[PDB]
Amino acid sequence: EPKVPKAPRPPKQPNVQDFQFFPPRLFELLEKEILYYRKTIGYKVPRNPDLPNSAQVQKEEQLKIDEAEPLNDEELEEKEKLLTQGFTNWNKRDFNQFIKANEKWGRDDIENIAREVEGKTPEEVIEYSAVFWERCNELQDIEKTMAQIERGEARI
Amino acid sequence: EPKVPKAPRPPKQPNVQDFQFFPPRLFELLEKEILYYRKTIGYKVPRNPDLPNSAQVQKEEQLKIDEAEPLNDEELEEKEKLLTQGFTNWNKRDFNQFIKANEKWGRDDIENIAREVEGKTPEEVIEYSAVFWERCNELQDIEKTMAQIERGEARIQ
Ligand SMILES: [Mg+2]
Numbered sequence: 001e002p003k004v005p006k007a008p009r010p011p012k013q014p015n016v017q018d019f020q021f022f023p024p025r026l027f028e029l030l031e032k033e034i035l036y037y038r039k040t041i042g043y044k045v046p047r048n049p050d051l052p053n054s055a056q057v058q059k060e061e062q063l064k065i066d067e068a069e070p071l072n073d074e075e076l077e078e079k080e081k082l083l084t085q086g087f088t089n090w091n092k093r094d095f096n097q098f099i100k101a102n103e104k105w106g107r108d109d110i111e112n113i114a115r116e117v118e119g120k121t122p123e124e125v126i127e128y129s130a131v132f133w134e135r136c137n138e139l140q141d142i143e144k145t146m147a148q149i150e151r152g153e154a155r156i
Numbered sequence: 157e158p159k160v161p162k163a164p165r166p167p168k169q170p171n172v173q174d175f176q177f178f179p180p181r182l183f184e185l186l187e188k189e190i191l192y193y194r195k196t197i198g199y200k201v202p203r204n205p206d207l208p209n210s211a212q213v214q215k216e217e218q219l220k221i222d223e224a225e226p227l228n229d230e231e232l233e234e235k236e237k238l239l240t241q242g243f244t245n246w247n248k249r250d251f252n253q254f255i256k257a258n259e260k261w262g263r264d265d266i267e268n269i270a271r272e273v274e275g276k277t278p279e280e281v282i283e284y285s286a287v288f289w290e291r292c293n294e295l296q297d298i299e300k301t302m303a304q305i306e307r308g309e310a311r312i313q
């Protein structure tokens with residue numbers, strides 16, 4: 001069991017993914033919603049043993065919940081648009097197939113990559129690839145994913 | 157927002173979907189985990205002043221939380237198995253394409269339904285279809301969904 005359980009999130013919040021490359025502003029808005037949700041259910045931040053200024057960390061995090069407020073019409077307007085500015089049509093399977101195809105054919109072989117990504121057209125793949133190679137650093141576990149593809153691309 | 161905020165769930169809980177038809181026992185086990193999570197974070201059930209005898213309901217719910225316990229070894233083993241007894245490889249796009257293909261070609265045209273479900277072969281479609289028609293009654297917006305399908309099969313005549 002976690003020394004500190006993961007803090008709760010709004011049950012009906014959108015399941016946006018890192019590989020969909022939405023803009024960072026979207027997550028700032030999502031974090032506002034998460035903090036407000038925590039305020040509404042009376043969530044209290046547990047103090048963390050290690051960290052020295054634990055009392056300071058805990059207080060900092062609680063204050064963020066304490067001062068949380070709903071998203072106003074402006075912000076709500078902004079979020080709606082932001083949710084269209086990502087690769088909403090790319091799911092986990094598309095991503096995994098994209099990664100395996102790159103390892104197999106090399107990031108250059110767009111024709112073969114698209115052929116192996118079942119839910120996507122060459123057009124969709126060229127567009128996604130351009131963004132992927134531009135901000136894949138934002139992803140998590142990429143250092144391992146980049147070496148994995150580099151091993152296969154170089155192994156060819 | 158809701159009058160009463162939705163109660164918290166473990167952020168790390170498996171994301172099982174209704175259209176994946178997992179055994180109902182699995183959700184009974186996931187509920188035990190949700191209750192233990194709520195106990196674990198100190199969550200308090202709010203009193204819904206609009207239920208009549210809301211005091212009793214509140215106390216009943218809070219007791220379920222207060223008496224919550226983690227899953228034992230047996231249940232942990234049962235859960236791991238149940239997590240493989242659903243259509244784990246069927247995602248939301250597969251499901252949406254399946255539904256639209258049934259409306260577009262009729263439920264018996266496996267050849268065309270499979271062609272339109274990009275990530276599934278005809279064999280996988282038959283297996284899913286066999287369960288779907290057995291308990292699609294468990295799905296959220298089924299009446300509407302089924303009416304539309306019965307309509308597509310109607311236009312086809
Ligand atoms: Mg393709």
Ligand SMILES: [Mg+2]
Pocket residue numbers: 270271272273274275276277278
């Ligand atoms: Mg198919």
